[PDB]
Amino acid sequence: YDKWEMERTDITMKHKLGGGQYGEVYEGVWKKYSLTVAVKTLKEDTMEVEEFLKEAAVMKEIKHPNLVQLLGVCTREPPFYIITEFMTYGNLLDYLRECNRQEVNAVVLLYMATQISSAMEYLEKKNFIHRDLAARNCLVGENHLVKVADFGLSRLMTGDTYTAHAGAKFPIKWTAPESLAYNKFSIKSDVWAFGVLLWEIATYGMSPYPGIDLSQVYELLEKDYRMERPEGCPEKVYELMRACWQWNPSDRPSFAEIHQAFETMFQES
Amino acid sequence: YDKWEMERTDITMKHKLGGGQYGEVYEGVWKKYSLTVAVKTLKEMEVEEFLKEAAVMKEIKHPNLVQLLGVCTREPPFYIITEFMTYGNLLDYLRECNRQEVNAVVLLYMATQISSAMEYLEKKNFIHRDLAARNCLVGENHLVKVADFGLSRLMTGDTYTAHAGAKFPIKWTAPESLAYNKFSIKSDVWAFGVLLWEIATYGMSPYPGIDLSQVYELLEKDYRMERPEGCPEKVYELMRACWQWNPSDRPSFAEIHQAFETMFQES
Numbered sequence: 001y002d003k004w005e006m007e008r009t010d011i012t013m014k015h016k017l018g019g020g021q022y023g024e025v026y027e028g029v030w031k032k033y034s035l036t037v038a039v040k041t042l043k044e045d046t047m048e049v050e051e052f053l054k055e056a057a058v059m060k061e062i063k064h065p066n067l068v069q070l071l072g073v074c075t076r077e078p079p080f081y082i083i084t085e086f087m088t089y090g091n092l093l094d095y096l097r098e099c100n101r102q103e104v105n106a107v108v109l110l111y112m113a114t115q116i117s118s119a120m121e122y123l124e125k126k127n128f129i130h131r132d133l134a135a136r137n138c139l140v141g142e143n144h145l146v147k148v149a150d151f152g153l154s155r156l157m158t159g160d161t162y163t164a165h166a167g168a169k170f171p172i173k174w175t176a177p178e179s180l181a182y183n184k185f186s187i188k189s190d191v192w193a194f195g196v197l198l199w200e201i202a203t204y205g206m207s208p209y210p211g212i213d214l215s216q217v218y219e220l221l222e223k224d225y226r227m228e229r230p231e232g233c234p235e236k237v238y239e240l241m242r243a244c245w246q247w248n249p250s251d252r253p254s255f256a257e258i259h260q261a262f263e264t265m266f267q268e269s
Numbered sequence: 270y271d272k273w274e275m276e277r278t279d280i281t282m283k284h285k286l287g288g289g290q291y292g293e294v295y296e297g298v299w300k301k302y303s304l305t306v307a308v309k310t311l312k313e314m315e316v317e318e319f320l321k322e323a324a325v326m327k328e329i330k331h332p333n334l335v336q337l338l339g340v341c342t343r344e345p346p347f348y349i350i351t352e353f354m355t356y357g358n359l360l361d362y363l364r365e366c367n368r369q370e371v372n373a374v375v376l377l378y379m380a381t382q383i384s385s386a387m388e389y390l391e392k393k394n395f396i397h398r399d400l401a402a403r404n405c406l407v408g409e410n411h412l413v414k415v416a417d418f419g420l421s422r423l424m425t426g427d428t429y430t431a432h433a434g435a436k437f438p439i440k441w442t443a444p445e446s447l448a449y450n451k452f453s454i455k456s457d458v459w460a461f462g463v464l465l466w467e468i469a470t471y472g473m474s475p476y477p478g479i480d481l482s483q484v485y486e487l488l489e490k491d492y493r494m495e496r497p498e499g500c501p502e503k504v505y506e507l508m509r510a511c512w513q514w515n516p517s518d519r520p521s522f523a524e525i526h527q528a529f530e531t532m533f534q535e536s
Contacts, residue, residue, distance in 0.1 A: 045332060048332065048382075048410075049332060050378065050381050050385070054533065058534075163367065163369040163370040164519065165410050166412055167409060167410075217522060226325075
């Protein structure tokens with residue numbers, strides 16, 4: 001903490017980010033290093049204070065090339081800041097939608113999946129769950145560098161389940177069946193969401209379950225409906241997708257297994 | 270009151286709140302904002318005391334203290350309007366919650382929120398004098414706020430003498446307060462420790478089965494409630510610290526909030 005703490009005047013705010021979709025997040029400048037950074041602030045709730053402060057606390061422990069890196073924190077007095085590295089190309093979802101597909105080709109899609117699964121393998125090991133894996137929550141740097149947004153992590157031993165608060169609302173099309181029905185999350189519900197992220201990647205950012213009424217998604221999942229293989233998607237990547245979407249969470253592969261499979265595919269590419 | 274004064278007609282009064290335990294407090298709807306609120310009334314307790322606690326609430330602002338929305342002090346009935354906490358009081362909430370959801374980390378989160386409120390009061394030279402789970406309120410996403418009706422300001426401090434005559438919830442009341450009607454932030458610290466016990470037991474009654482007449486003497490001869498099943502030793506250490514016989518031996522809310530914040534963050 002003390003090693004992490006900056007004075008607020010170290011930072012100047014440049015442009016509000018998002019635009020707005022992530023809340024009070026700003027492009028800023030770390031003045032002494034001429035460094036563009038991302039600065040999370042806390043407006044009057046908004047997030048509850050102790051929640052905000054814990055986000056900062058957990059990130060101090062996170063060190064991985066594909067997880068957004070904490071740079072510093074202002075927590076002595078308001079306004080509270082969480083300062084992290086800035087990913088110059090923004091979120092993965094818009095990146096895929098707007099890219100040149102001759103550049104962002106099949107081998108780059110593999111590279112992206114490999115990077116994300118590596119972060120998730122680290123989290124699985126460490127052992128946290130993410131709970132909101134999706135392309136909109138991945139960030140892109142130069143040369144197709146991808147980092148997973150890091151800010152809502154929760155501590156949970158791998159064999160254990162986290163029960164979300166009563167009334168919580170979920171991004172339904174990314175959400176595992178046991179989460180939809182019993183508010184239960186685990187590293188295996190992250191695996192499910194990763195499957196949907198894979199589909200987002202293979203489709204260059206299409207919306208999942210196109211046209212399908214949200215209130216019928218769970219019922220469909222129960223009867224073993226799953227999204228079809230995207231055009232151009234390799235069969236082995238689709239199989240991995242489908243394994244991520246097994247009904248029983250303990251049938252789903254680990255991220256260690258998933259990363260290994262992508263690493264091999266990327267290396268053989 | 271200039272910015273705080275509303276028309277009584279601005280509000281649509283509904284059912285009495287919380288089974289009547291509070292007791293002249295009603296669920297209500299602010300028509301203009303379609304915002305359901307909590308309305309306390311005096312049809313005309315002492316009017317001067319009603320006005321006093323209204324004025325105090327105008328000075329209080331903290332994310333974990335119940336927020337004042339408005340006031341009607343022109344003509345009776347008198348209104349004091351506050352936000353409505355949708356998950357009711359913390360005592361009932363704990364007794365009925367799914368404990369898989371409201372598990373150890375969430376109990377730490379509540380304690381952190383409450384102690385934060387109390388640290389704010391400590392610093393602003395107020396005391397509360399009625400800290401207990403029934404006087405804490407719960408909103409969406411495990412948000413907890415302390416009810417702040419009846420806060421007292423220490424004009425010269427830091428000990429406040431209650432009226433005559435006044436009767437207290439014995440099982441929550443510090444020994445020097447039972448003995449001499451003296452209340453301080455340190456007697457709030459004592460009550461906070463009982464509150465922790467309430468939280469750790471998911472809302473059990475303190476000193477179960479013990480005769481009220483014996484409580485003071487028991488405490489004097491160093492009886493203290495034992496560690497609740499499942500309560501971390503460090504949490505129970507804090508309870509015991511809160512229950513130090515000599516008030517000046519009890520920790521401050523600043524220290525308390527720091528301890529809980531750390532434990533919360535580490536979970």
